[PDB]
Design a protein around this ligand. Sequence first.
Ligand SMILES: N[C@@](CCCO)(CCCC[B-](O)(O)O)C(=O)O
Ligand SMILES: N[C@@](CCCO)(CCCC[B-](O)(O)O)C(=O)O
Ligand SMILES: N[C@@](CCCO)(CCCC[B-](O)(O)O)C(=O)O
Ligand SMILES: [Mn+2]
Ligand SMILES: [Mn+2]
Ligand SMILES: [Mn+2]
Ligand SMILES: [Mn+2]
Ligand SMILES: [Mn+2]
Ligand SMILES: [Mn+2]
Lengths: 306, 306, 306
Amino acid sequence: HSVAVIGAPFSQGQKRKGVEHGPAAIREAGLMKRLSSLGCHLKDFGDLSFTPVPKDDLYNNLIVNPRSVGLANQELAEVVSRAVSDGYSCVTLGGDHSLAIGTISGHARHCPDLCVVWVDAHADINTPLTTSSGNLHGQPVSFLLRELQDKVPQLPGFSWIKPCISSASIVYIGLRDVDPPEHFILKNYDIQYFSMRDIDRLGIQKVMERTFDLLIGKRQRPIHLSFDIDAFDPTLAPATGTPVVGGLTYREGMYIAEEIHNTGLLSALDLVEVNPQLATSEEEAKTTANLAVDVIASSFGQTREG
Amino acid sequence: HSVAVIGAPFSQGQKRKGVEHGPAAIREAGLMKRLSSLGCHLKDFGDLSFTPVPKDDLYNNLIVNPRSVGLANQELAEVVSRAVSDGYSCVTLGGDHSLAIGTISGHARHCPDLCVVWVDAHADINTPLTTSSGNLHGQPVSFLLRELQDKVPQLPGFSWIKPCISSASIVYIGLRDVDPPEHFILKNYDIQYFSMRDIDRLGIQKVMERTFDLLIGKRQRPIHLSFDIDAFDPTLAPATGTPVVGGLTYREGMYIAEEIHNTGLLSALDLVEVNPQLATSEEEAKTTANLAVDVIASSFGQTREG
Amino acid sequence: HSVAVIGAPFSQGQKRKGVEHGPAAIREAGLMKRLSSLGCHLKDFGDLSFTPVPKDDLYNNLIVNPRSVGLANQELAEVVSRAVSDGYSCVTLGGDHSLAIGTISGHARHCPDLCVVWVDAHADINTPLTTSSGNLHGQPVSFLLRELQDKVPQLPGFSWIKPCISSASIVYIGLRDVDPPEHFILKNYDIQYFSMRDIDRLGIQKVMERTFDLLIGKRQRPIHLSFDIDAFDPTLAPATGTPVVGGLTYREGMYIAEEIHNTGLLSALDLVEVNPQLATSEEEAKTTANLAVDVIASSFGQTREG
Ligand SMILES: N[C@@](CCCO)(CCCC[B-](O)(O)O)C(=O)O
Ligand SMILES: N[C@@](CCCO)(CCCC[B-](O)(O)O)C(=O)O
Ligand SMILES: N[C@@](CCCO)(CCCC[B-](O)(O)O)C(=O)O
Ligand SMILES: [Mn+2]
Ligand SMILES: [Mn+2]
Ligand SMILES: [Mn+2]
Ligand SMILES: [Mn+2]
Ligand SMILES: [Mn+2]
Ligand SMILES: [Mn+2]
């Protein structure tokens, strides 16, 4: 049972400074010791240094840093693919959520039947034609879903990406801030999700049951858990760039991670969008980083009953 | 789909200064743009100025400002009745909860088969003979309930009031601070309520399902939503006159409002008891006012899934 | 209906100063008036002064203040036994949880068929051979449990203790910080528990139903409620020695207590581990003390509906 930890200090998928310090904050909160204590054999890749791209001008006068996000993701994908091939479950510390483009591509490279659990306040499924921000961290799923590719134009630095999962192969949990074109996309391609409303109705236990039934009800598949810290209520995870009131409780987040662990299928985990600079106090930054560690640890077997 | 907004800056239903600034606070939290964005056609009646009453002495050496509360409500009912008759769903911003005497009377004047969902930590059903405070914001339901007529003395300024709701036409949600004579009244007239305890047991989905079965299970009826901000836990809505621990969560509040919207029958809404002056900080005032806007917006169609 | 209140200002079951002030803090939060208001006839035993033991050296170079904890508990057990004998439901205010040794022994003397509901973030069932702290407040169940007596060494000051609880006769609620030897003990003796995880799944209503089915499903038994304030989430009860995130909500705590009261079988209650000195502010101290009073009051009939 081996875990690779990769620091992906990326900020260019969005516009708020400081999310590149997320991996450091998470390590400082004791991630490595927590993983070791659960019996994980660890390989720390440290924090990647991504190759910059000169003159990375706006795409279509809207999409920011496309070539940089493309190249960093290509490089990240290579590291992830390599680590999976060497038998590691891959933990990637962000950094903004655009790096899921790289971790999922790399993961899918030799685990092409992987499935995705995307825990997030947001659907992150705008395309370059629907985004109203230009921020790639709100578009990553659009580049990964095969059903969407007729609707996704080719960005500079993105040509290496081949859409690698189907719309039946991703489930969202925690949605509460969805743009209308994203809502259209989720309905049009019948992508399954559990918004905070569904959690309010069903409860987190049934949500996880139905999630796994949809994804691995008929066959075992390596699971890719892409966890945006903003899934949690901002009272619990204030240090993040797009906080939305009414999020997961601490207990709900742990229960999700616990059930992920319980499948035995976790193969890769992203923990993204922790931005210590956006905390109004050091206490706020640390509680956010500590929560991130709790999620990762619970995902690899830490329980609440000993 | 048209919405009238009436500010009712009234404070004389109770003794704490500042609740008359509720409407301004709610407006400053961006109410009108939020309703507009939902597609609501808006008529703003502004904030009403109520006629003062000279020498408005205590009634029975106990009940405070009876004629002022009576007259202000008569005037409010007139504005409400007129807006409902012209085809608007009527949003009244308070102000203390005694103004529900006027909004429900005025609403019933045009829609006599209305039913009432009363979301509150309190039952607000004391009569002039049971009140231990003398505050009319804690008695408004007693003046409206037909079955209580013979137990409710005639107050100066109140003669215009015709009880318009039967005891089977109101359901309470969120109760946790109920005076013993209020409890007797609720039981003796078989008035249905879901206390915080019931919500703990059933969950808010079943609570809303049962609420609608009781009210509109036999026929469609216009719905009057009377929402006291103190229904929410004090941590979420600190700026209010009688906070009680152990209240609705943010998610529960939104769920109630969403289900109200989903009936298609919402005809009037009160958002009462926001008192910015009781905030310990400007942050606390704004979070309470923002919460008020979320309740109203959700009640008119804002969703958590886009 | 008679209730005896016993202050047990003991701190030597652990190493953090201040928990000996728990009883005064709880009294200051208005305990006696709250109990009177519910119709409780009260006998106040005041705060006991426990006989000190000179030269109370570590047992086995690890276990702290054993003779002092042994003797204080013997004296406590005598007071509890006497009060229960005289027809009182016994409320014991702590003080650290090592005093449950005393209250449960005293209680069991006249009510040998008693059962125990242990509400706590922790299992408190380490033995002198498994404790890693040496603190007796984390071992009291091991001395009470019949099935364990062959694995529990004889401590100085502890010879008066006769195990009086069988493993089928105690149920835990709220567990989330369990040491591995404790987990082993719970599984090996088939001791039933509902962790925070079980509550997330079942909901607190089902948890209480099953608790009582296990304890009193076949016959009526006097109930001993041992409530560690740290069962509650640290945001609600910060003034305590071993806080653990992800605890009971206020509503869940009240619901447990309400259900205890509804059995009609509550015979004794411990409210332990309030340490006002661990509060970072007087507000935090008072809110913890107030929460303790809420629990005790609800356990004796305080309702949320009047
Ligand atoms: N949907 C957003 C906001 C658009 C304006 O409403 C937010 C995307 C958030 C990215 B995340 O990784 O945090 O979920 C976007 O930038 O696309
Ligand atoms: N029930 C109260 C308190 C009486 C003392 O227990 C409070 C009523 C609150 C009015 B609201 O509009 O806020 O719910 C009253 O004044 O009647
Ligand atoms: N289990 C602890 C911690 C051991 C180190 O992990 C804590 C016991 C808490 C005592 B309580 O009365 O608060 O539940 C112990 O001292 O045995
Ligand atoms: Mn997000
Ligand atoms: Mn995201
Ligand atoms: Mn109220
Ligand atoms: Mn009210
Ligand atoms: Mn304990
Ligand atoms: Mn404990």
